[model samples]
Target: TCPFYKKIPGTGFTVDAFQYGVVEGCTAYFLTHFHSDHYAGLSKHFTFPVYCSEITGNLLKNKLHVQEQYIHPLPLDTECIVNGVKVVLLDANHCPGAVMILFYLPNGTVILHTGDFRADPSMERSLLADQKVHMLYLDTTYCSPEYTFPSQQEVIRFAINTAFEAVTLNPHALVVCGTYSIGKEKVFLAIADVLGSKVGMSQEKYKTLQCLNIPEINSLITTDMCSSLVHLLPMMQINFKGLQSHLKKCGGKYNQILAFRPTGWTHSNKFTRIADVIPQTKGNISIYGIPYSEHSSYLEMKRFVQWLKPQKIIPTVNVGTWKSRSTMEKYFREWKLEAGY
Candidate 1:
């Protein structure tokens, strides 16, 4: 089976695929989120109905122009029967509308496919308590021990506090923050609410944020000369060369450039805690990498595995040299004892 679509041994439903190929066959499909990598093969002309969060469905309908009739919106914490299987959507807490799919198979087995998520106590209580989760398909993005970081809330607070300090310290500097196209809007929204200033974004990003209908974020689709000091640009735009070129073009109006990236890789590289803000300078631009991520760290994953104690764990990523099912078994040997499996 391909990494994108996993068919149950005895079910008609498969997870996350837009087409049928060898080892890919299903009467229906589940979409975790609207990220390009997860949704690479989807289109308006898709044959199977996709069950996903309302926000993701809307993106498929309005943004991607997928036919409305083919998209089914599954509300969080609600059970919906799809092709005779009891399916429920849980908040993935990765992006605005990411969800984890919990499938209650007819054969008295439960399978949880965490599309991409950070482990929090709320999810554990909701999904893992009642009975055995027979099979577990994990995100495993930060599965290695070197990838530990703190909660998103703590990281966001640190970013907000540091951005405010930087703004106050250098009034004329253009403060730039980088984020993935869809994720990390919460950080910018928090910054907006606290600083009494709206963050500036490109038209596409603003449109994506606007669709969420979150009134708290005051953002404007900005041009190059946008007057706002705080700018929320895409990750590609925040590179050292890109920042310098943009700053040089806007010379006299701005004194210097400050960049911050909220990501998990910073912690893996140097063991940065949530509260720490590590700064690096290149040429004329100063960048701060914040340990803000939506994925669970190695420790968090360990705890989650210990709590769930699934019969078998499958790592979802397989594109390159990513390790698969055996990694969890090898890493969490102690958990195997506590799990009693």
Candidate 2:
């Protein structure tokens, strides 16, 4: 029941449960982030008032067209009472507005739901406070030891350098970076600032970023596609079909096209649904996938669990599958062995 939303047994509170599944008569709802999977099926007709970071709430109103009144903004690191439950939002370090939810139930049990985060050493001090965490809903997206990769900041530097290298190698070539609409804006901004160039975005994407009000990002967006040397593209458009359609209509203007996708899944050999770390070059186009992730690696996850010492750990993904339980058991067994527990 890790990824799946549980109704807190008798409590009418719900977290990350409505989009994937229906929530019947929930007293209050908590939104961890604004990612599509987490916000699936969300509409203007949202049932309960949503609780999330200020930026995420704006995204809900601007991107999803959710009414402003229905969106409740929670300041980070601030404790508030939501329907008699003491709640606090901690920086998740996954994306701009992602947060881990801390719920102090009326019964005195404390539960922590890590939405999707990479554990940072700076956050450990804040997390290891006096309160005893009873249960932890962990982000186990890359829970295997084989999922190790470079840090996000390092990856961003690599992407910026790679794009620079690509364009320097061929000045006439177009540099296309694959990124999400909300997350990975820093990578694009860094590249743009380094190159002293403007990055193009769709009208909708520009509006979405504007709503975020991030000064570092707001100043770099451009709609002038032809004049921009580096284009900030959606992750889904980094492939052949997507690129081909765009290039077929406008390929003649540029000498070549070079693309890169920054993601953590580059560590797996079988994870080739998209291009991997090693560069793949074809006619007039070269593509490479750099290792960049927002989620914690397995080693990081182990350290986080050890430091927090939650009574029970529930994986937040891949829990409904056949081998889920066995896989989790093995993970914990190895964890205990590594910790000499």
Candidate 3:
């Protein structure tokens, strides 16, 4: 039988399971990050004593308006005792304020809950350097073999070049970058810095980003829409109706618009060569769906699984789909048998 993942099966804690208001054995509420999907039921009425990074805690308090008294912020890479259990925090590398929660249980089994991560060499450095994680509550969002994407840096470089080339092709073009509120900061920031342009966004979003305290974020963003040609917009606004309404809102300042819709699913997996992701165009609009993901790719997942070799893997994503789960299990079993884990 598949263990009930929401409660971490054998512990007195719960990680990102706020929806189930009264989790029977949960002593504390551990928030991995501030993503909407992960933090659905959390609101001002949240009663569980919360535990997360300082940044995440601040976002909750400031953005979500959750009471500050319930939050317990922990420093990264340091061990802390909570409800008689040993725990540690490590960078998730997926987005700002994200982390991989580590639980060193009383039975000596080390459980690592990777909230959401873009697997990097740091996973090996901070996690594998000392401990053998017995169970990994993983972020298997891109576990399928076909979802492998190119390196993030390579994708970022291409995005910068694409923006520059597009501007060269259409001078005085309004470059609108699509965002997920938190993720994809690098893509837009690169575009702004590389082209020596400022970004336009709402005052509220600018304040929320200030919680991240990223130095370059302030220098690159402006609230006044007219001052900058580069606009940092939400993903919802990238659609046909939304774009048209936005251009009209700006009083037809520019003749055309360029949108960089960066996400993993946006790029076709079969796309092997560089610059393979071509732009999809409509009369005055150009949308470049760059393969920029905050989740681990299939190939990267293989590398992480082989190196870490956890005793058992508990997937965090694709949790309900039986076929997807079984396929991933088959892959894990093969790797486990080959490596003797």
Candidate 4:
């Protein structure tokens, strides 16, 4: 029951429910990630319990600060049971605490939901056992030939270098970047690690982090702090105008202070609607397009759906899934993108 759901008039499937109609007898439901698109409408229906990895659970609790009681967190790469269905959470080379879900049903149906994954060999090998997956849900959002995003490691390198370069060039400026309140926790931590202090989170985001047990990374700034070099700098939680205001007020004379903004739709706006509410940063701010996406490519999307080998497949987290006569046409057009594949 994820969000942006639709109902088929002649069929027995919800809007985002996949092709095979095992809704009633299915033992459990698997939420691949905490992204609203992946699991927005979960709480709407209480028919079956949801299963996810511990970090995913932590993120939901930390991000939403509600419905913590509903999640059942499992360990990484370990098989577990939910309502008698087998499930596993494998690494998805995307955001922090993200995972790819493998659902093995009691009826011998194996569905692999690559929830916004990347082309990481470690991730690939983890799930590439000889046993083929029956159905695979992919992240096909950036499936276009020109999308050649650098590796995650490269992204981190670019982030830190860009930040430091800005600071060195103009030290008096206040850096402002964009990120999600819940999903991009590591970005803040990375900043703290590099700067030896937090850039500052809103009282709201800081409270959310505290509730999720994400420590104030300031506590780990000592010499012994085990930090990942492949991380971004700490980011402050500031809105666009707030971003401009803070920069204007605080950035005395230097222009080197740097920040990042992941300008995109939030979970609630799966169909790319609701653009206003999510903060937008446009000022003297140096907005950088990292060109990173979590979903699958056009070829991968095609191969993934083909590999899923499901008797039927349903399009999730998008408009036009409701079977307007034009829905299939739009779906086919968008589904044909190929990102660097």
Candidate 5:
């Protein structure tokens, strides 16, 4: 099931050695990005030389804990030759550090693999340079057109407003928000940075952010420095109630404000309603829900594929049968939600 081949699963087409048209002793393979779909098989099965961005390799090693001996870092638009194959890694601004990879074979067959990416104007130069793509493996997690996403700035602004409102409304209460360790560090920094200007955090929250390596607050609704903006490490808790008063008092004179990171899964189970958002058993804590998502929306997906304009498309996200019918089909010229490979 390696990528450098022309065999289709569940079809009559088959290859004997399972190796494609590589020459005598070639052993090169290319990794597109570090998203779960693109690199899942690599974690357990892949043992070939894999080319990835430097950032991608760091994430794989430190975040996903994947260890591979043959990882080569490719800077943006850098082309390298290994084992008679050409590899190119291009910018794919989907996440913090996503990249699209293209492999060039001696037989004139070119293949491009894209992780969860959207075609933003920022990537226009990269796509223009790769005008010769033949086969494209894409992420079709969002092929519908109705999905709408607000700008990241708007989302962050609204999230801060909501959190501040909740804190003021419940002065004697603890305020908790849930976010990811790596992706949502900005939210915590924003809150701490804004409040740090007027009042500091509980010793616990401040200490927690300190441990997370979050930067010290240097601004209050003013110009900012990138390093100081969100240098904090990360902070979270197993239970919200346990850290409530402890963190509130840690804030010193700012004891009125207590902020803790809650687990997102807690909001889904027995706590689904507004009342359940902050359980009384948890000490009258206030919760702010932000609609931030790492995944691309339906519109972003469609525009991305349209820009690629490949003759064929592949849906990489493994959806169940009910959802697989949505990949784009050439015949219908519409999204084939039920017709995925």
Candidate 6:
């Protein structure tokens, strides 16, 4: 998969394409979320106006240091005019400050760009049910059949249970939860609350969450690292060697590492419980990969297509190579047929 496609046809607007920097003839720049991949190539040097949600705008100001004068934060679920076109921001349910963009062209064309969202039924009720979307730019990260997985809450509970079982064996075990910049907050928060433990995080991660302005998460953050059994670490720091080094720093107080890697790639073929997973172990280290994805699952995409039945569909992701694009085309074909296309 190529991750995402930025160009939208017939409009001088580009979404998640700051890498192109002042794309020729594109009059507007749109950012769907604050993820590094989406915000790639965006720096203080960026001069074009960037349209995003309020939280995303704050992130650009605080994190990327993009100029506030060029930042355009749209109100969620409300209509506004952008270059004479009616536009709206709908909650993407993927991460903090993430949104799905809907554009109403004056030519009576309706375009929807789902910027890396976990498709939810509420989206239909939240003003999209009546929209006759002419073109849909979909997040095809998990468009394949093999990528089908459970709900986000189910995976969160699974991670909590997985952590609970680990700590039951070693009460003094240090719980390390892996996360990216913003998507997997619920997993760590749930694990911390469920396990009744404070969460420790780096100063950078803490500030990132503060940009999110979530008091619920803020209330759980602890200053003392040792006092908190559960600690949040970047995805890169959740490996065997990584955990080994972290454990050494703990001064032999904790018995072992009960680490959980949360991502959609965890489940591929079928649904498997913690007990059924292939052991991720190395020299007193244990790791579990939970199927927690920010992107929509295969089933969710199918259901969305089946319901929405857009006149045209463009994959925002996994379209770089011919094989990847055609594979997604096959899925679109199957879903369309079911949608009575």
Off by over 4 Å in 4: 1-27, 41-48, 60-69, 184-188, 210-242, 248-257, 263-285, 297-341
Model 1 / residue 282 / CA error / Å: 4.1
- Pick the winner on TM-score between candidates 3 and 5: 3
Task: Report the alpha-carbon TM-score of model 2 versus the true structure.
Answer: 0.90
Ranked by lDDT, top first: 6, 3, 2, 1, 4, 5
Model 4 poorest 10 in a row by lDDT: 224-233
**Of the candidates numbered 2 and 4, which has the greater lDDT value?**
2
Per-residue alpha-carbon lDDT of model 1 for 165-250, expressed as tens digits?
87688777777888775777777667755666667767776667766656544443344346667787678887888898778766
lDDT of 2 by residue, 1-341 (tens): 22344445445677776655556667777888888878777788885788899989888888888888888898888889887778889999887789998888888888888998998777787744758888888888877777777677767777778778777887777777887747767777878777778888778777877777677664587787887877877889998667766676555777777787776676453553223355777777777777667888877888888777777777777677769767876887777667664
Give the worst 10-residue stretch by lDDT in candidate 1: 216-225
- For all candidates, the clash counts are 0, 1, 0, 28, 21, 0
Using all chains and alpha carbons, the TM-scores for the candidates as numbered come to: 0.89, 0.90, 0.94, 0.64, 0.61, 0.93
Per-residue lDDT for 102 in model 6?
Answer: 90
Clashing pairs in 1: none
Worst 10-residue lDDT window, candidate 5: 224-233
Per-candidate RMSD vs. true structure? 2.7, 3.2, 2.0, 8.5, 8.7, 2.4
Which ranges in model 2 have alpha carbons more than 4 Å from their true place? 1-5, 20-22, 248-252, 267-277, 336-341
User: Per-residue lDDT of 1-341 in model 3, one digit per residue for the tens?
Assistant: 22377566557788887776677767888899989878878989887799999999989999888998898999998989998888999999888999998888888888888899989876788855797888888889988777877888999999889889878887768889887668778888888877788888888878788888687666888898898878978888987677777788787678888888886764465755557777778878878778888999887887888899898888888878789889989888887888776
Which is the better candidate, 4 or 5, if ranked by lDDT? 4
lDDT of 4 at 146: 39
The sequence of per-residue lDDT tens digits that candidate 5 reaches over residues 166-278 is 55665443344443333444565566445443223333334223322224433322222121211121244424553454454434322332344432223243334322333
lDDT of 2: 0.76
Per-residue CA lDDT of candidate 4, range 240-267, in tens? Answer: 4454565554435533334565433233
Quote the positional error of residue 213 for candidate 2 in Å: 3.1
